[PDB]
Amino acid sequence: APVVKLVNLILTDAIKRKASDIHIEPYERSFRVRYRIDGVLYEVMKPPLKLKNAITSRIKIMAELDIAERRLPQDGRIKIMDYRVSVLPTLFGEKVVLRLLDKSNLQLDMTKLGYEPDALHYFKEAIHKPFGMVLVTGPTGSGKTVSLYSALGELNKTTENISTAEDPVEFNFAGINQVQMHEDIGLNFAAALRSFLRQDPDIIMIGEIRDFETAEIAIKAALTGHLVLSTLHTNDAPATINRLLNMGVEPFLVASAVNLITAQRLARRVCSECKQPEEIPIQALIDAGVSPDEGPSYVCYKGTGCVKCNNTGYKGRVGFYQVMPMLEEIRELILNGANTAEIKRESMRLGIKTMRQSGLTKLKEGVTSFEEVLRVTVADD
Amino acid sequence: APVVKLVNLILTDAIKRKASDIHIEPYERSFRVRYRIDGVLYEVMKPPLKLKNAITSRIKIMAELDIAERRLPQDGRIKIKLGDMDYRVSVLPTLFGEKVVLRLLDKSNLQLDMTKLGYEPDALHYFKEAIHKPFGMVLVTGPTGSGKTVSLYSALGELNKTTENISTAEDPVEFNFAGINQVQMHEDIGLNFAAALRSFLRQDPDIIMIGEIRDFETAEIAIKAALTGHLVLSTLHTNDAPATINRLLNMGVEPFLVASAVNLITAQRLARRVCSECKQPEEIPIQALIDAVSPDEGPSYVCYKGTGCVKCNNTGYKGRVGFYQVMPMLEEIRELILNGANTAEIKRESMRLGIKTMRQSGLTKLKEGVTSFEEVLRVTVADD
Amino acid sequence: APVVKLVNLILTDAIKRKASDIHIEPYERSFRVRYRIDGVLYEVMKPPLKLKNAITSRIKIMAELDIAERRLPQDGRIKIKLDMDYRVSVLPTLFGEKVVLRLLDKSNLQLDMTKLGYEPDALHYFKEAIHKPFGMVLVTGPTGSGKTVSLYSALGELNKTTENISTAEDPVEFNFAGINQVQMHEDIGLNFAAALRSFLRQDPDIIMIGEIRDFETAEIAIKAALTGHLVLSTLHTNDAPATINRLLNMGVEPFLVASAVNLITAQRLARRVCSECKQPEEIPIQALIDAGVSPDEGPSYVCYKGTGCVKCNNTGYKGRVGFYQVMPMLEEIRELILNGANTAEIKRESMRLGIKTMRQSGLTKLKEGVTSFEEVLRVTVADD
Amino acid sequence: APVVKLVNLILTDAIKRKASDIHIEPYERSFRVRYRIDGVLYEVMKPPLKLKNAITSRIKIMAELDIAERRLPQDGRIKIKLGDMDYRVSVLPTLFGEKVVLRLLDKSNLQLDMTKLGYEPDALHYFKEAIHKPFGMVLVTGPTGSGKTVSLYSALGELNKTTENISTAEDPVEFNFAGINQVQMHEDIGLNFAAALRSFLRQDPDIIMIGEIRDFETAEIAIKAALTGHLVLSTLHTNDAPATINRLLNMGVEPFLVASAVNLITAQRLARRVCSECKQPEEIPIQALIDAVSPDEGPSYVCYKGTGCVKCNNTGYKGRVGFYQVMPMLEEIRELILNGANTAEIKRESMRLGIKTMRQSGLTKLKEGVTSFEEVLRVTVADD
Ligand SMILES: Nc1ncnc2c1ncn2[C@@H]1O[C@H](COP(=O)(O)OP(=O)(O)O)[C@@H](O)[C@H]1O
Ligand SMILES: Nc1ncnc2c1ncn2[C@@H]1O[C@H](COP(=O)(O)OP(=O)(O)O)[C@@H](O)[C@H]1O
Ligand SMILES: [Mg+2]
Ligand SMILES: [Mg+2]
Ligand SMILES: [Zn+2]
Ligand SMILES: [Zn+2]
Ligand SMILES: [Zn+2]
Ligand SMILES: [Zn+2]
């Protein structure tokens, strides 16, 4: 059947389009294909609804998945480019999602990630301190894994033992030993982490801590003399500090044993070809933004769209990073029971920028637009 | 199995008939199969008493009801093929038998428009401003038949866009939406709320919707979906917005987990609204009206009570106007769950912050003349 | 099968090579064996991936460990004869099981204090602390810094038929006749606190606890100190002065921190230059003066770097030595504790007194030609 | 069974010897049986290593210890026939064995006089006035070896009269009283705290005494005995007087049941008292002393610390002075358990009512010069 040609075309054009996700959704009256491009969905196709069972069925064949059951979700992988395949039992048919993991495009360069020079310096200084904790925070898809893999990429050596427990493992690294864990058999982050301490590790990587049990082991791994990398899901960088205390972690451990906390979120890049100045009133800029020391200097760009953009006005993505090293003063505020507003107050006062401030500086450089700054970052104060 | 074709024959006859209501209830002396047309009920069938147990058990199979317990009431719903059909079944143990009542459900004529749902303007501001975040979870609480599903569809219809992946899991789906991913689950095959969530997280959802969380297994990974960077919509049956926090804590969810995850709790209940034509002013002692209310605005209240007409069938009301309590989660409320909390003290905090509770909502609808004091006192507990 | 010979070869070459740790790690493409030698990892092997499942599998047999599960971590001990015994940790890596073997050398325990690189002046203080009838002496540093070597040597230093000495370790890394050693297991309900509570009921003279992780053990241990017992323990901190502040941050009141502790030491390890190939390296005096040394005698310094040789397998370094700061408490430091001084102030006075920093211990060791300049800069942190 | 006659031979030799302390502890290389005479310890025996497990297990049979767990510490006591003898046993798991320590118990020289026990005059008023009612229950809380049994004997010796039936159940009986009915229970035969109470209620007791209530089964019928019209005396191991109420509520006892039944909770702990001859004034910053104390009376404190002599064996203390917190149950406290309660809020209420807590008690004994700041900080948590 021609159906073979179509399934490959959907996967081939998704790679051509640099989409990070593929969606095949049947509906009652409709059938649609969506590509997610720079975190945003666009519908690239309308294949005929007669074929809905044929198009999905072969993708399960490629995944070595059972075609016989349409009533239940199924999961798997496909290597061709390689994709994580997720199947779901919608009322009107099965919806298939293919989420690509691109091995070659992973940057693995920190200067290339949009880190500001000062922020990069704190992060680099933080990761090479032995016996410390690095927390990378943000929502899903904010670049935590990309940032963290670059950190693991920056230090890898024959001289050190690096051990990682991830759920799932996003990419295979030579030289770094990765554990994939699934809870149904009893492997949790804590159990894998306790196993790590008996292996004589140097560097320890754990994807996230949702639990006090895992949190306590990981903070104990920091004080033992190993560098431990992890993530947390939070509204801002400071709030991870107060959330650790809410996890039940004693203040002295939070202050003493963790070197750094970062927060990052992702905004789309303005197109290099189509960008043109937009005139945004300085008072809208100042109302959330910098006071008008910089106001005359700001030039804000937006793309009109072109063939390069597929008429979106945006091509690519850039990080907005807030990097908070743990200051002696931050340690004192933790030890004193300080609240979140005061912790951010001193952090800004002491010269480490916020996410809105870092994003807003990227706007002055012309990398991102103003509408993206307001869409992504949360208003400060 | 002629009783099977005859069991369906009763429902099809009730389709041809105008009756909205059907009753099979068994007796030892006789067997009553009844239809209610235009509110009056009539006996239809005197079918076999030997197949009475067989038929009643069969209709229980249609509803996903457990036959293993005949001693306790069981409620549910069914779908029938038509060119669609849906019924809601209510089963009660009888001394001589098991009664089964089927009440029609009309899924049409109910729209999504969020302006007409009756949210108070300040309340709609909180609900609408809460339902757009990249981060959060929303909970709509009330009894079955409170219009919770309609309120969430209104939020969904406003949230639905071609730029996002919005998926829903409910059992059944009340309405069919074009473009929203809907998974209807029946637990016999192993489709479950929890299983639906674990399937959602691998699909890259922008927005997850699941109808209610009845337990921890669903609540744990639902809250995890909220902290992941997604938006979560659900319902619970509880007394209030703060009562929702208490039940969440009793399920075993950690206190920081609740205060971090959900940015909204909104409870509502439907109440009969007085007739347009039959409403007449009814004087009430203002002190009693005051007792429920602000004494300053007390004398300005005139509450209307309907008498009856051919439109309302002498009920003295017409439609349904809901009373809403919407509780965004404030930093103040956030600090109270984390420093330790009590249902009453959370009620006090939200109520001093300017968040209006159900009773005061029904009162404003009382002053406006939409409802009556009788109905407000029925559907709402006294705050003080 | 050759697997037997190959496994023994991996282990026997580890003993000849004086490695601290053995790693057999499978990957997707390559396969590797690593030895840790003098705190630094070097890969000595590339066995074929066909034997990878066999190589791990036989080691499990040697450990009396279950072959049936390849999906879970396993731990155990192995004793073999040429006799050597060391532990095993197995982990389920994506492409296979990685096995780590960490050598515990039975007859190689140092047992001598001067042999560890203690400063002549520092050693007197350490001995003075451990021979007092009451109070606690704390030795701090990261993992692998030799705290266990120092503590076992201290218990070795004073042991007598006249005293009952009791130690709680997790795990015990060596068995000594005359000292009664219990290996602690937390899963069975035995913690440091629970083990310590029994110790106070056993009528000890001197008590050893591996580390204090929290207040619960800290309070019990400090109360044992004031009882008339000498208690040996460790804490994880950056240096000796900060250990005082770590106790206070745990919630111990200042008066007990001053009164109940005799001394605090911190120590770390730097690699030792080759006996054969060592040669002078030229370090500019201004770079060394700004950090390494105050601007007196700096011109005289002779800095070494090894060229590498067959003795070192061209690493330039053979063996390692400790850098020690040993700080008994003078009344002036005790007075600052009682006055609420911060860490810098205690560090200022600790430095102002006879007490040498960790950099100072390394820099004196560099002048003797024992260690290089790169090692002194790599391990200890600059004091100001 | 020659090891049995030899096991007793060790204890009898320790009787002929002056040693207060015996240690069997096993080793793999050797076997150490040690006695401690005049505080110095000496190795006595090098008995068979083959019977080491046999002997150690046998001494565990003497103590009512469970042999089924060798992996965890077990503590207890034994009696020996002499013309009486009693020992307290402490068992600890060892890597190579199980250590057993026996420490002598001298039951003589401790009298009942209630004036010399050291209850503060206002505290003794509450305790003595509480221990006579026809209705109530008394609870004396503290750690093992706090003199709880001695305090209750003092109350008993004052309560004992020929006009009343006073019965006691404890395991073992510390002292033998003439005229008091004493039942010593060992749970193997089925004598139990609960069984002893059900036997008491049928005997028409005026006063019931039972040593501690470890569970609900005893607590339920103990409280019932208090409401019956009788007087109940017991102990618990807890942190404080209010902490006792919290544990009682956690056992499942209803809140009205606690507030109705117990009219007293008194916690105490023994602390070393400074030497008479060796006490010298030791100046302490009054602000720190103040921090623990009333700032008005702060400058008037002079606290004494002992140095050493031949009498105290250079310990710097001599005797034991207990710190007492006695908490009669006030109507104010009564209303707080019934309206809902918190450990901290009960502490606040009793402390504003004029009831003095442990810390302030130790401070008055500090100002009087009986004890020292070091000891007070060891045995008492800071109230504020
Ligand atoms: N600085 C950057 N420049 C370009 N692309 C980026 C940058 N940071 C992140 N991305 C893109 O965003 C995605 C981040 O996803 P990922 O980090 O895996 O999510 P998570 O961190 O939640 O696991 C990646 O696919 C990557 O291509
Ligand atoms: N002064 C020293 N000289 C030689 N080797 C040492 C010295 N200190 C530590 N080591 C090495 O360190 C290892 C033990 O480290 P350990 O004392 O267990 O550190 P930790 O107390 O952090 O666990 C031993 O194998 C020993 O070879
Ligand atoms: Mg990830
Ligand atoms: Mg150790
Ligand atoms: Zn363009
Ligand atoms: Zn009407
Ligand atoms: Zn060499
Ligand atoms: Zn003395």
Numbering used by the authors:
A (entry chain C): 181 to 260, 268 to 568
B (entry chain D), D (entry chain D): 181 to 263, 267 to 475, 477 to 568
C (entry chain B): 181 to 262, 267 to 568
What does the original paper state about this entry?
Despite the importance of the T4aP and related systems, little is known about how the motors of these machines work. It is thought that the energy for pilus extension and retraction is provided by hexameric ATPases in the cytoplasm, known as PilT-like ATPases. The typical T4aP system has two PilT-like ATPases: PilB and PilT. PilB is thought to promote the polymerization of PilA monomers into a long helical filament; this polymerization leads to pilus extension. Here we determined crystal structures of PilB from Geobacter metallireducens under non-saturating nucleotide conditions at 3.4 and 2.3 Å resolution.
After screening several PilB constructs, we found that PilB from G. metallireducens (PilBGm) formed crystals that diffracted anisotropically to 3.4 Å in one dimension and 3.9 Å in the other two dimensions. The structure of PilB was solved by molecular replacement using GspE as the search model, and we were able to build residues 181–568 in each chain. Three chains could be built in the asymmetric unit, and an elongated hexamer was identified in the crystal packing. There is anomalous signal in the predicted tetra-cysteine zinc-binding sites, so zinc was also modelled into these motifs in each chain. In four sites, ADP and magnesium best fit the electron density, even though no exogenous nucleotide was added during crystallization. These nucleotides must have been pulled down from the cytoplasm of E. coli during purification. Herein this structure will be referred to as PilB:ADP. In PilB:ADP, ADP is bound between two packing units. One packing unit, packing unit 1, binds ADP via the Walker A motif with magnesium coordinated by E357 of the ASP box. The PilB:ADP structure also contains an apo interface between two packing units, where no nucleotide is present.
